[PDB]
Amino acid sequence: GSKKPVPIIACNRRTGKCQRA
Amino acid sequence: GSKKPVPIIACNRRTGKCQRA
Numbered sequence: 001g002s003k004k005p006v007p008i009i010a011c012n013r014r015t016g017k018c019q020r021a
Numbered sequence: 022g023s024k025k026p027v028p029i030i031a032c033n034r035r036t037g038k039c040q041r042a
Contacts, residue, residue: 005034006034008032008034008037008039009031009032010030010031010032010033010039011029011030011031012029012031012042013026013027013029013041013042016029018029018031020034021033021034
């Protein structure tokens with residue numbers, strides 16, 4: 001999670017964290 | 022878009038699609 005290459009975010013199966021694209 | 026290995030979904034940067042984990 002640093003820049004916003006896309007509007008819609010996306011989460012992942014780790015510990016509860018998402019990001020852009 | 023077939024199996025849900027995780028509750029929180031994630032939208033990829035393509036054309037407006039998401040998935041689980």
